[PDB]
Amino acid sequence: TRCKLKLLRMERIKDHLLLEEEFVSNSEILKPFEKKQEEEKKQLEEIRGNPLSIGTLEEIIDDDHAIVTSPTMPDYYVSILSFVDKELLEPGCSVLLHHKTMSIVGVLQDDADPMVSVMKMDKSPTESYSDIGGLESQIQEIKESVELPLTHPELYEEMGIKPPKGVILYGAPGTGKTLLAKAVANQTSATFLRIVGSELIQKYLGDGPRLCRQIFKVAGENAPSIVFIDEIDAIGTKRYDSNSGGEREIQRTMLELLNQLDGFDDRGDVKVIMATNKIETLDPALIRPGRIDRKILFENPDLSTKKKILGIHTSKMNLSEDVNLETLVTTKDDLSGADIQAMCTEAGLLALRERRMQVTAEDFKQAKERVMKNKVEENLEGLYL
Amino acid sequence: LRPGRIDRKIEFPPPSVAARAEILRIHSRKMNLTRGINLRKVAEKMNGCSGADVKGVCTEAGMYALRERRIHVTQEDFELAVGKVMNKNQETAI
Amino acid sequence: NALVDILPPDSDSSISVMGENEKPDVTYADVGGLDMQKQEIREAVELPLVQADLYEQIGIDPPRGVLLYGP
Amino acid sequence: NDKVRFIKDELRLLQEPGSYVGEVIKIVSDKKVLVKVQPEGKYIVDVAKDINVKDLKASQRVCLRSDSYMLHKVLENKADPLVSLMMVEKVPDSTYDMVGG
Amino acid sequence: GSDREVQRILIELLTQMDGFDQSTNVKVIMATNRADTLDPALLRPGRLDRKIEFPSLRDRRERRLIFGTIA
Ligand SMILES: Nc1ncnc2c1ncn2[C@@H]1O[C@H](COP(=O)(O)OP(=O)(O)OP(=O)(O)O)[C@@H](O)[C@H]1O
Ligand SMILES: [Mg+2]
């Protein structure tokens, strides 16, 4: 209550004062700037004028020439002159030419793409570890290889040897795999890239291999990084025809997935994190340990772990003395954690239909009957074979 | 449908005799109606499956009164129309 | 580069109309069969040009575009 | 007298060395605007003393004078790109009483 | 580029069939030989409404007529 508001007012007396001070000293207080900043801005602007025509650099020559290609088309053999550094010149880069005699007046151009938008993430999850609590020691193997060599460089120099790489998450569904990943990217606060494995198969042919070579050049740049390939099982069935899938498209994705993660390339820091529920279809050139170190195995939790799990979800709901929290856990006999989460979303859906705004012992024992009927109606064994 | 992804499932019934007569009534207002026309008698003759059927009988009757060169849509046109629409749907679904 | 006058929408057209040229050589004597599609085309095409006033006074909308498809 | 002096001066106003329609990709805090001439390639070119780079927002269709590509005015026109995709699809909306029964 | 010219034409063709509504002209007739390449926005209502299928089995009274006019 008060804790939050003291700090929020403290950063709105910082933001206000700094903006008034920093605006006044660019428009009135000029002494280390003044003459010397008015001469440098005047020289660079006059010398190149405007309009400036953006080009794309195909190749450099080291005697200070370049072959640039306009994007319209007409090619040009331009000169590298004045107010330019050759440290940023290189293929693919965007340069400014003077619209009459085209000389490279400088490089400052980087123009964001809608193909680098889909890959990069803006998110900051609203859950952090210990909303996953339970299966406690399964996030305490992903913290030994993702978080821990960044935080303490000391311990991995003290033992020596190369540090771990990667992890695979596989196992029973309803064991939280998707939120486990969404928690190791929020703790560290490293640049978290995120791609589903089903975008790597597209109707277009051989477009697979170009897309994931792109993903890893973006990742190497922002390094240190975490790459989520969520659902790399999906590459096993999703296909649009038999050549947009089939041996053809599945081999192209392997080959690619193999180069990015270990090749001649001599990759910088990409940690990889994969979500999956198929281990017996993966490349045998990845579950080769020594790309991917400790793999994590997940199973349905047991009755005391499911007591820690039902306590995270039931504080959300309205609380009463009537509620029998311990007896929903007991009756369930190694049932997953995705059901426990479908039962507390079902308790406030029955509660709203009544228009009674208390969640009590009656609303939870009714919501368990609806959750056990969908999975049990789909069991058409009836009289046990 | 991994457990906990879906919280509402809306099944859509084929049309009841109260559901078929309320869709038929909204379209009937553009047509002309002379006194004596019950829209409940037409709604019990049909059986429907869909809300495309219930609107296409009323649309078919505005085509018989056009051919006739009759401004008003009176009660012979909806006898012919129920006969064409039900006969058409038994001969494309067979 | 200034708009100094307008031109009729009849003028500067891709194609001269063909209704002023001579009429196609086929008439209804050479149509044989397909008598079932012939009653659905005299209604859809012919009747909304000559008499727009039969559709509107009933309150029905005439069919808009006509598609022909087959082998 | 006013009338014969509207015509004589309208002869000067109708002469245009050239004027394009561009669109603002992105601004830069150099007091320059990156404008895409809409059939061609891109050009970075600063603003005239008629407007500020505070007023120009992303994907705003602007006026350009093809003499040095100097921004004259903001152009009135501009369509949302989503208004475009929703309309070529075309999908009616309804109310609850016309889907009732 | 050749996909971007085909596609600009077709988008323009939908927006001009909309304007064409409420004019005495009966909206464009068009034909296709294989109807299974038909883009979904074109056939959607508001542009095309009627689908005159042209059978090829026909009966014995409608085949006779086709013989009788070529005879
Ligand atoms: N062991 C656990 N501890 C705490 N919360 C859990 C646990 N298991 C599941 N949950 C809760 O269940 C929710 C649904 O899980 P999620 O959708 O991430 O599971 P999943 O195993 O990734 O499913 P899938 O099998 O479809 O890949 C989680 O977001 C999480 O809060
Ligand atoms: Mg998941």
Contact D63, D76 (CB under 8 A): no
Q: Decide if A227 contacts A271 (C-beta within 8 A).
A: yes
**In ligand 1, which atom is closest to the CA atom of A305?**
1
Which tokens sit at A243?
């050549």
Angle A245-A249-A254 (CA atoms, 0-180°, nearest 5)?
Answer: 130
- State the DSSP H helix or E strand holding residue A225, giving kind and residue range, or none if neither: strand A225-230
Q: How far apart are CA A83 and CA A67, in angstroms?
A: 19
A273 lines ligand 1 (CB under 6 A): no
Residue A223's Cβ-side half-sphere holds a number of Cα atoms within 13 Å equal to: 13
D81-89 and E2-19 are packed helices; what angle lies between their axes, rounded to 10 degrees? 70
Ligand nearest to the Cα of A302, by number: 1
Does residue A173 have its Cβ closer than 6 Å to ligand 1? Answer: yes
E strand map for chain D = 20-28, 32-37, 42-46, 61-65, 70-74
Closest residue in D to C3 (Cα–Cα): D14
Q: Which two tokens stand for residue B26?
A: 């909204």
- What does the alpha-carbon distance between residue E59 and residue C36 come to, in Å, rounded to a whole number? 11
Q: Pick from A160, D97, C62: which is nearest to E20 by CA?
A: C62
Which residues are CB-contacts of B16 (< 8 A; sequence separation ≥ 6)? Answer: none
Distance from C-alpha of A311 to C-alpha of A317, rounded to nearest angstrom: 11
Cβ-based burial of A177 (10 A; exposed 0-12, middle 13-18, buried ≥19): buried
CA distances E20 to C6, C46, E13, E23, Å, are 22, 18, 11, 6
Q: Is the CB of A300 under 6 A from ligand 1?
A: no
Q: Which residues of D touch C4 (CB under 8 A)?
A: 14
Q: Which residues contact A375 (CB under 8 A, 6 or more apart)?
A: A339, B3
Phi and psi angles of residue A120, each rounded to the nearest 5 degrees, phi first = -70, 145
Report d(CA D39, CA A183) in Å as an integer: 46
DSSP string of E5-38, one letter each residue: HHHHHHHHHHHHHHHTTTSSS---EEEES-GGG-
User: Which among A174, A349, A375 has CB closest to B7?
Assistant: A349
CB neighbour class for A283 (10 Å; exposed up to 12, middle 13-18, buried from 19): middle
Q: How does strand A191-196 pair with strand A225-230?
A: parallel
Tokens of A290: 């020594």
CB under 8 A, 24+ apart: contacts of A26-35: none
B35 near C CB under 8 A: no
- Which residue is listed with tokens 């790597």? A200
As a whole number of angstroms, the distance between CA E33 and CA C69 comes to 6
Quote the ligand 2 centre to A285 CA distance (angstroms): 24
Measured CA distances, B34 to B52, C61, E18 (Å): 25, 21, 35
Phi-psi region of A330 (alpha: psi -120 to 50; beta: other; left: phi over 0): alpha
Whole-number Å distance between alpha carbons of E2 and E9:
11
Q: What is the enclosing helix (H) or strand (E) of A58?
A: strand A52-61
CA distance A79 to A93: 16
Residue B44 touches partner D, C-beta closer than 8 Å: no
Write the CB contacts of C36 (distance below 8 Å, at least 6 apart in sequence): E55, E62
Q: Do B2 and A345 touch (CB under 8 A)?
A: no
Spatial separation of the C-alpha atoms in residues A127 and A131, rounded to whole Å: 6
- The annotation status of C70 as a binding-site residue, yes or no, is yes
Distance in Å from the first CA to the final CA of chain A: 59
- Mapped onto helix, strand or coil, the DSSP state of residue A4 is helix
Q: Ligand 1: which of A126, A140, A175 to mutate, most ligand atoms within 8 Å of CB? A: A175
D97, amino acid identity: D
Q: Is the CB of A337 under 6 A from ligand 1?
A: yes
CB-ligand 1 contact for A171 (6 Å cutoff): no
Residue A67: count of CB within 10 angstroms of its CB: 13
Q: Cβ neighbours of residue A102 under 8 Å, at least 6 residues apart?
A: A53, A55, A68, A76, A78
Neighboring chain E residues of D88 at a CB cutoff of 8 Å: 11, 14-15, 41
Gap between the Cα atoms of A374 and A258, Å rounded: 41
- Residue A174's φ and ψ, nearest 5 degrees, are 65, 15
Rg of chain A over Cα atoms, rounded to whole angstroms, equals 29
What residues of chain C, 3 to 62, have a C-beta less than 8 Å from chain E? 29-37, 40-41, 44-45, 48-49, 52, 62
Helices (H), A316-380: 325-331, 337-354, 361-377
Give Cα A347 distance to the centre of its chain: 33
The two tokens of residue D100 are 């009732």
Residue A56: closest CA among A7, A90, A100, A26: A90
Residue C7 zone, left/alpha/beta (φ > 0; ψ -120 to 50; rest)? beta
Experimental method: cryo-EM
Neighbours of A244 (CB within 10 A): 17
**Helix, strand, coil content of chain D in percent (nearest 5):** 20, 30, 50
H and E: helices and strands count for chain C: 3, 1
- Kind and range of the H or E element at B62? helix B51-68
Please give the C-alpha separations between residue D2 and each of D5, D7, D83, in angstroms, as whole numbers. Answer: 5, 9, 45
Contact map slice: B 58-77 vs C, CB within 8 A: 59, 62-63, 65-67, 69, 71, 73
- Which residues on D lie below 8 Å from E18 (Cβ)? 90
Contact B2 A341 (CB under 8 A): no
Bridge partners, residue A298, by sequence: A171
SS3 A266: coil
Residue D43's nearest CA partner among A72, B74, A63 is: A72
Q: How far is the CA of A177 from the centre of ligand 2 (A)?
A: 5
Between the alpha carbon of residue B62 and those of residues A321, B51, B56, C43, C71, the distances in Å are 67, 18, 10, 13, 32
Q: From C2, which residue of chain D is nearest by alpha-carbon distance?
A: D14
Residues 6+ apart with CB under 8 A from A297: A170, A171
Q: Are D57 and D80 in contact (CB under 8 A)?
A: no
Those residues with Cβ within 8 angstroms of residue A285's Cβ, 6 or more apart along the chain or in another chain: A254, A258
Through-space distance between the first and last CA atoms of chain D, rounded to whole angstroms: 72
Nearest to B3 by CA among A153, A376, D70: A376
C48 is in an annotated binding site: no
Contact (Cβ atoms closer than 8 angstroms) between residue A64 and residue A109: no
The secondary structure of residue C11, as a DSSP letter, is S
Distance to chain B for A140, nearest Cα, Å: 26
Q: How many CB atoms lie within 10 A of CB E19?
A: 8
For residue B24, what are the contacts with CB-CB under 8 A and spacing of at least 6? B39, B42, B43, B54, B55, B57, B58
Q: How many whole angstroms separate alpha carbon B15 and alpha carbon A265? A: 64
Whether the bond between A71 and the residue before it is cis, its omega within 30 degrees of 0, is no
CB-neighbour burial class of residue D53 (10 A; exposed 0-12, middle 13-18, buried 19+): middle
Measured between beta carbons, which residues in chain B are less than 8 angstroms from residue C59? 30-32, 62
Question: In this structure, what token pair is assigned to residue E61?
Answer: 């009274």
Q: Which chains touch C (3 or more CB pairs under 8 A)?
A: B, D, E
CB D20 within 8 A of CB D37: yes
Q: Is the Cβ of B6 closer than 8 Å to some Cβ of chain A? A: no
Quick check: D41 and A96 CB within 8 A? no
Residue of B nearest to C40 (CA): B63
Tokens 């007046």 found at: A105
Question: What resolution (Å)?
Answer: 4.5
Tokens of A99: 């619209």
Q: How far is the CA of A273 from the centre of ligand 2 (A)?
A: 12
Residue of D26, D42, D45 with shortest CB distance to A50:
D45
Residue A226: C-alpha distances to residues A123, A136, A229 (Å):
14, 21, 10
A234 C-beta neighbours (distance < 10 Å), count: 19
Torsion sign (Cα): A24, A25, A30, A34: negative
Strands A75-80 and A103-109: parallel
Residues 38-97 of D with CB under 8 A from B: 97
Q: What's the burial of A80, exposed, middle or buried (CB within 10 Å: 0-12/13-18/19+)?
A: buried
Tokens 């403290």 correspond to A10
The most distant pair of C-alpha atoms in chain E lies apart, rounded to whole Å, by 52
On whether the CB atoms of residues E48 and C66 are closer than 8 A, the answer is: yes
Half-sphere exposure of A167 (CA within 13 A, CB side): 25
Residue D41's Cβ-count burial label (10 Å; 0-12, 13-18, 19+) is: middle
Residue B54 near residue B20, CB atoms below 8 Å = yes
State how far the Cα of A233 lies from the Cα of B74, in Å rounded to an integer.
63
Report cis status (omega within 30 of 0) of the bond before A51.
yes
A341 Cβ below 6 A of ligand 1: yes
Please tell me the distance from the alpha carbon of residue C42 to that of residue A128, in angstroms, as a whole number.
Answer: 71
Per-residue DSSP letter, A136:
G
Q: Which of D10, D13, D14 has the most C C-beta neighbours within 10 Å, making it the best mutation to test the interface with C? A: D14
User: CA torsion, points C37, C42, C43, C46, in degrees to nearest 10?
Assistant: 140
- Find the closest chain A residue to D33 by CA distance: A51
Subunits with 3+ Cβ pairs within 8 Å of B are A, C, D
Cα A175 to ligand 1 centroid, rounded to whole Å = 5
Residue type at position B54: V
- Residue pairs between chains C and E whose CB atoms are closer than 8 Å: 96
Measured CA to CA, the distance from residue C26 to residue E51 in angstroms comes to: 23
Compare all CA atoms of chain E with the CA of D87 and give the residue at the minimum distance.
E15
- Distance, first Cα to last Cα, chain E: 51
* Tokens coding A113: 């793409």
Q: Which residue has the tokens 């996909």?
A: E3
* Sign of the dihedral through C-alpha E61, E64, E70, E71: negative
- Which residue pairs from E12-18 have beta carbons closer than 8 angstroms and sit at least 24 positions apart in sequence? E13/E42, E14/D88, E14/D90, E14/E41, E14/E42, E14/E47, E15/D88, E17/C64, E17/C65, E17/E46, E17/E47, E18/D90, E18/E46, E18/E47
